[PDB]
From Swiss-Prot:
It comes from the Eukaryota. It comes from Saccharomyces cerevisiae (strain ATCC 204508 / S288c). Present with 5770 molecules/cell in log phase SD medium. The chain holds residues 695 to 828 of 1287 of the full protein. This is Antiviral helicase SKI2. Disulfide bonds: none annotated. Belongs to the helicase family. SKI2 subfamily. Component of the SKI complex composed of at least SKI2, SKI3 and SKI8. The SKI complex interacts with SKI7, which makes the link between the SKI complex and the exosome in order to perform mRNA degradation. It is found in: Cytoplasm. RNA helicase component of the SKI complex involved in 3'-mRNA degradation pathway. Represses dsRNA virus propagation by specifically blocking translation of viral mRNAs, perhaps recognizing the absence of CAP or poly(A). Essential for cell growth only in the presence of M1 replicon. Residues 1-121 form the Helicase C-terminal domain.
Length: 334
RNA sequence: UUUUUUUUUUUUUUUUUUUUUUUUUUUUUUUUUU
């Protein structure tokens, strides 16, 4: 049970588990959250996990959430939990801290984005500074970047470039806006346009070799995107803005590995032949196509704002080319 | 290396014909070739 499976397979496994047909199950963390399917034995492979930035010992809250799904009322007299030890003793202080201790409620750092700033500048009145207090040094630095690349003027009035970025919510407002206004995407076909846009959707956490040959084109598109991203990255560092892990290690990861998978999906090819060459499981491929529906909608909106009807019809064709029957399969619970 | 599915609004037709407008006049015998 993990996130790389198709929804139908995952719900099939859940239903079979609920009927007492599965004895041994290897599960990820998502199984514990919700998913009211208790069991009798819970075994921890390790008490540490890698969450984005490095390894970290399990918090007491997660341990309580996972271990609590071990005793079913009526059929069991006690709930057993097994912690493994692999030819090496484990420290007792860490064990006591993980197992015994008051859980703490989570908190968020309230990340500030450029889309939020651009949306807040269009609101009549609403002095922004007096609301941020109830982050101030960061807000001034971000305003200087927006004025440098001509998103706003000297009086902080939103221009045409800023209006487009206000409609892009997913991940990267400034880079996408620069790409659209640079007459990019005007030479490619609908199949090739959606193939290049997957870099903003696929995070490239794999380490497998990318396809050595893609096409004579779609390689110039790779270079153009990387140059534009590199130029935007220099502006960010000029104003001394702290960067997130995702934005810092963007070109370091292999985020272009799914172009071939998306390219053949839109061109028309049986999904069995696609999986013979894709570097990700079936569950991951369907997620990428699902996330590419929102990107096409945003680019269609930007075309109306700037008045380019050629780009509007290209994006309409792309949406119809990435729809298949398997992504609309009915749930087995219904 | 866990974790991440986003998609705005409208209902069943104004009433009475063809006309559709400018610069000033005359006088007495057939037919053909000349």
């Amino acid at each position: 049970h993990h996130g790389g499976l198709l929804p139908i397979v995952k719900e099939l496994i859940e239903i079979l588990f609920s009927k007492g047909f599965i004895k041994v199950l290897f599960a990820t963390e998502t199984f514990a959250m919700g998913l009211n399917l208790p069991t009798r034995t819970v075994i921890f492979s390790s008490i540490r996990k890698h969450d984005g930035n490095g390894l970290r010992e399990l918090t007491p809250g997660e341990f309580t959430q996972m271990a609590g799904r071990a005793g079913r009322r009526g059929l069991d007299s006690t709930g057993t939990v097994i912690v493994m030890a692999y030819n090496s003793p484990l420290s007792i202080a860490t064990f006591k801290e993980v197992t015994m201790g008051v859980p703490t409620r989570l908190q968020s750092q309230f990340r500030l984005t450029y889309n939020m700033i651009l949306n807040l500048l269009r609101i009549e009145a609403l002095r922004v500074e007096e609301m941020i207090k109830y982050l101030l040094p960061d807000y001034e630095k971000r305003l200087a970047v927006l004025k440098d690349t001509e998103f706003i003027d000297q009086n902080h009035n939103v221009l045409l470039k800023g209006r487009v970025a206000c409609e892009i919510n997913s991940g990267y407002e400034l880079v996408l806006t620069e790409l659209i206004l640079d007459n990019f995407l005007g030479s490619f076909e609908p199949e090739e346009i959606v193939a290049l846009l997957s870099v903003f959707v696929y995070e490239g956490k794999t380490r497998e070799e990318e396809p050595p040959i893609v096409t004579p084109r779609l390689a110039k598109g790779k270079q153009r995107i990387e140059e534009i991203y590199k130029k935007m990255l220099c502006v960010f560092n000029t104003h001394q803005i702290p960067l997130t892990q995702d934005e810092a290690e963007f070109l370091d990861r292999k985020r272009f590995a799914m172009m071939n998978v998306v390219y053949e999906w839109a061109r028309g090819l049986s999904f069995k032949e696609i999986m013979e060459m894709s570097p990700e499981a079936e569950g991951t491929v369907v997620r990428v196509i699902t996330w590419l529906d929102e990107i096409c909608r945003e680019v269609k909106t930007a075309s109306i704002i700037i008045g380019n009807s050629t780009l509007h019809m290209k994006m309409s064709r792309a949406q119809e080319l990435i729809k298949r029957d398997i992504v609309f399969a009915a749930s087995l619970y219904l």
